[PDB]
Amino acid sequence: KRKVVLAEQGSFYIGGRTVTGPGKFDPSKPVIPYSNEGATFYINQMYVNFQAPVRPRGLPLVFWHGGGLTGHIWESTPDGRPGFQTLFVQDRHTVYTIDQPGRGRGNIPTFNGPFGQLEEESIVNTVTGNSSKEGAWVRDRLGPAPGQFFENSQFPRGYEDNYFKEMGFSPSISSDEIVDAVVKLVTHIGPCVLVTHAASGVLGMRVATHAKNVRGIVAYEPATSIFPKGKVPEIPPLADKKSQIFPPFEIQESYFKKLAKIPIQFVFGDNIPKNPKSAYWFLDWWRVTRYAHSLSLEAINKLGGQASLLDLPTAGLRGNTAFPFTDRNNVQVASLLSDFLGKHGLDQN
Amino acid sequence: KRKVVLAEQGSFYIGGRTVTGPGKFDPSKPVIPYSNEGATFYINQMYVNFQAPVRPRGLPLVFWHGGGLTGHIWESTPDGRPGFQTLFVQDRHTVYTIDQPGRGRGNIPTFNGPFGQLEEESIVNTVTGNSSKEGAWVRDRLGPAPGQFFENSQFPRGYEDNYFKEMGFSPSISSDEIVDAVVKLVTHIGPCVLVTHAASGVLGMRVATHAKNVRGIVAYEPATSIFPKGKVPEIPPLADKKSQIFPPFEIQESYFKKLAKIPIQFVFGDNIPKNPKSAYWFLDWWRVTRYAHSLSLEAINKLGGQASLLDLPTAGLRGNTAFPFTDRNNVQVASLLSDFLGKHGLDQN
Numbered sequence: 251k252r253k254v255v256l257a258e259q260g261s262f263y264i265g266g267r268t269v270t271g272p273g274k275f276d277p278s279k280p281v282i283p284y285s286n287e288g289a290t291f292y293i294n295q296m297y298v299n300f301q302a303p304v305r306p307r308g309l310p311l312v313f314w315h316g317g318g319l320t321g322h323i324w325e326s327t328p329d330g331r332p333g334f335q336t337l338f339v340q341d342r343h344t345v346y347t348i349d350q351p352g353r354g355r356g357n358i359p360t361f362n363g364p365f366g367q368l369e370e371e372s373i374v375n376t377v378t379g380n381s382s383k384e385g386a387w388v389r390d391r392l393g394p395a396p397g398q399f400f401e402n403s404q405f406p407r408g409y410e411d412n413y414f415k416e417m418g419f420s421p422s423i424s425s426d427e428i429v430d431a432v433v434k435l436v437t438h439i440g441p442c443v444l445v446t447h448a449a450s451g452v453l454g455m456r457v458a459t460h461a462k463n464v465r466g467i468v469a470y471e472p473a474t475s476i477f478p479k480g481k482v483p484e485i486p487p488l489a490d491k492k493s494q495i496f497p498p499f500e501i502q503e504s505y506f507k508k509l510a511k512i513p514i515q516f517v518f519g520d521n522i523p524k525n526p527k528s529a530y531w532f533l534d535w536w537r538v539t540r541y542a543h544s545l546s547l548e549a550i551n552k553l554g555g556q557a558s559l560l561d562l563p564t565a566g567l568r569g570n571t572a573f574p575f576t577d578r579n580n581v582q583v584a585s586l587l588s589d590f591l592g593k594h595g596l597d598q599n
Numbered sequence: 600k601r602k603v604v605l606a607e608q609g610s611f612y613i614g615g616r617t618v619t620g621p622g623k624f625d626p627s628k629p630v631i632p633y634s635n636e637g638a639t640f641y642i643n644q645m646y647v648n649f650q651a652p653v654r655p656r657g658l659p660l661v662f663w664h665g666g667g668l669t670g671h672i673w674e675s676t677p678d679g680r681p682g683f684q685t686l687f688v689q690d691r692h693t694v695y696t697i698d699q700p701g702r703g704r705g706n707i708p709t710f711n712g713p714f715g716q717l718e719e720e721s722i723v724n725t726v727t728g729n730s731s732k733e734g735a736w737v738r739d740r741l742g743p744a745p746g747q748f749f750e751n752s753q754f755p756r757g758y759e760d761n762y763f764k765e766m767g768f769s770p771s772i773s774s775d776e777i778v779d780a781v782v783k784l785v786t787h788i789g790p791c792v793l794v795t796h797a798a799s800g801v802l803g804m805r806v807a808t809h810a811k812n813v814r815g816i817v818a819y820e821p822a823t824s825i826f827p828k829g830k831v832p833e834i835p836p837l838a839d840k841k842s843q844i845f846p847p848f849e850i851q852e853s854y855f856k857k858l859a860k861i862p863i864q865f866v867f868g869d870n871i872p873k874n875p876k877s878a879y880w881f882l883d884w885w886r887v888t889r890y891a892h893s894l895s896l897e898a899i900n901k902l903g904g905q906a907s908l909l910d911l912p913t914a915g916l917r918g919n920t921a922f923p924f925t926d927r928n929n930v931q932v933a934s935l936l937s938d939f940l941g942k943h944g945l946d947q948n
């Protein structure tokens with residue numbers, strides 16, 4: 251059912267700073283080609299979209315895309331089925347979707363000169379990085395190798411091109427400045443729930459430690475674990491005995507403790523191996539990363555928290571990729587999110 | 600005024616091509632840091648958003664942002680009032696809003712290496728260009744100089760930060776590929792009307808010559824004129840006696856003649872001087888640019904066309920900037936668009 255009734259919708263920019271070129275702006279001189287002379291540039295701002303239902307219930311949801319993605323992934327699946335934006339406006343929540351600084355409609359900080367360079371200052375690096383289709387195929391666990399699907403896959407087959415077209419690079423904006431923009435959004439919104447994904451998992455945890463308005467977190471397949479400073483547990487290398495997962499983020503314990511004050515759920519899909527898998531690097535990477543997250547959640551619970559790990563196969567859902575919210579069974583995944591919101595009173599006024 | 604009822608909404612990717620790095624992808628080797636080895640990259644694809652009302656009447660509208668912009672400018676004004684997307688869904692049209700290749704949720708083609716470079720191939724230039732706040736202020740005719748406003752201005756004063764935060768750079772993707780993506784969209788949708796702005800003006804004219812499904816064009820402040828090959832009239836240089844306007848685009852007469860088969864309206868706001876203005880480059884640029892457009896429309900009409908120029912002040916609207924659809928009087932600007940659609944039956948089934 252695709253119908254949606256909105257009390258209001260719109261979008262806006264929030265956060266960011268400015269940087270300035272040298273010299274002066276003279277309106278009598280040719281303005282094009284564009285010049286850094288007398289220039290003021292707005293950089294690192296974030297794009298925010300909102301859709302509000304009639305008679306909302308409970309807290310607004312802020313959907314935060316994963317690495318190299320945009321708010322598109324909450325709008326529609328690659329095969330054109332409704333995304334979580336539609337599903338949760340229908341579930342009577344106001345829904346915010348963002349494009350974080352450096353992605354989509356967020357700002358890409360570049361000027362007149364080599365990419366990212368403002369005269370002699372490097373605002374972001376000129377050299378970029380970006381996953382290939384092949385790297386994303388195995389990262390997202392469509393299958394063990396590019397072009398191959400797990401038998402049980404919930405991926406919308408036949409729409410591979412549509413899916414990979416949604417992905418791209420991120421300039422080297424500091425994570426601090428990305429967190430700063432979302433903290434400012436949370437200040438503007440009021441009490442809310444963060445729904446994060448992959449690379450935004452660790453960022454949403456950080457935002458919660460700076461923003462008491464975050465009243466709950468649901469993180470789909472978070473990519474980087476978080477621990478109190480100096481208390482990172484033993485985490486093994488990968489099966490190739492040379493690689494490691496992402497270095498866990500460490501925060502002051504007084505900030506980490508704020509994570510124990512709200513309900514937190516990490517959600518993982520299927521086909522993460524239980525045993526070392528040296529033939530398939532990213533499958534093994536997910537094995538050890540999920541393990542590190544289990545230890546992170548345990549650390550929160552030992553501070554009095556309520557942090558849980560939901561493996562979708564234990565709930566009866568088999569074959570999900572790293573994007574469970576755009577898989578073929580995304581309505582069932584959404585139902586589990588509604589269950590979490592209902593258990594914790596986040597769907598009541 | 601804010602309530603919107605959607606039979607369906609969503610977004611999707613369309614257009615683009617693929618490029619590749621050397622070698623083969625091995626899933627047992629570390630996938631991160633990302634590599635060009637064995638890589639397939641999707642590049643130059645376009646993001647498309649659609650909102651459809653219950654029981655649409657007439658043709659879908661395709662809103663195409665100007666230079667360095669995104670579909671945000673059709674969603675909301677800088678001060679948060681409804682944009683043309685909401686207004687025309689309420690006016691019973693299905694509305695498509697795009698982020699063209701190179702902008703917003705469209706693809707920015709870059710890889711592992713210096714910006715835009717895939718091994719030894721330069722997909723897009725590493726050196727970028729980007730307007731300052733000051734350049735944009737005078738380009739968009741907020742006032743003759745940064746910080747100043749024209750009398751009776753319709754700009755949402757006080758929301759300059761929001762406004763300028765929506766602007767950014769565009770990589771050097773060829774115009775051919777941008778036009779290609781929209782031609783593909785037009786085929787997918789079927790008969791439609793293109794509503795363009797500034798830089799997308801000339802591109803929309805080109806799309807229409809390649810796509811019969813374009814049944815009408817409304818262009819807000821187009822930046823580049825279009826003429827038949829070898830038939831560009833004499834265009835005076837600017838008052839500084841050194842600058843000129845954008846070199847007019849020239850196409851084969853066969854293609855140019857297609858523009859005479861559909862209704863076309865160019866819409867201009869206020870404060871474009873009638874006489875030479877050497878002290879204000881962009882004001883003078885706009886004077887001669889509008890003059891060139893008048894001759895372009897004359898050429899279309901001499902081939903049997905239905906082309907017209909609408910100056911908002913003559914319609915009773917004073918103070919508009921180069922973004923009349925986000926100005927304080929944008930509802931009145933929308934009414935004039937509805938009038939054009941009604942005159943040509945483009946609001947009827």
Ligand SMILES: CCOC(=O)c1ccccc1S(=O)(=O)NC(=O)Nc1nc(Cl)cc(OC)n1
Pocket residue numbers: 316317318319379389390447448449450473474496497572631632633
């Ligand atoms: C599903 C969309 O993709 C992701 O978010 C994702 C998922 C798993 C692993 C890495 C990423 S990532 O590419 O975004 N990377 C990161 O999460 N951050 C990151 N951290 C480190 Cl230490 C290195 C690195 O290199 C690209 N990248």
Ligand SMILES: CCOC(=O)c1ccccc1S(=O)(=O)NC(=O)Nc1nc(Cl)cc(OC)n1
Pocket residue numbers: 282283284665666667668728738739796797798799822823845846921
């Ligand atoms: C409202 C956003 O601003 C515009 O769309 C706009 C308006 C007037 C002039 C130029 C642009 S532009 O910067 O987008 N540029 C172009 O339209 N194209 C363009 N053509 C040429 Cl031959 C040169 C050039 O240099 C920046 N740029």
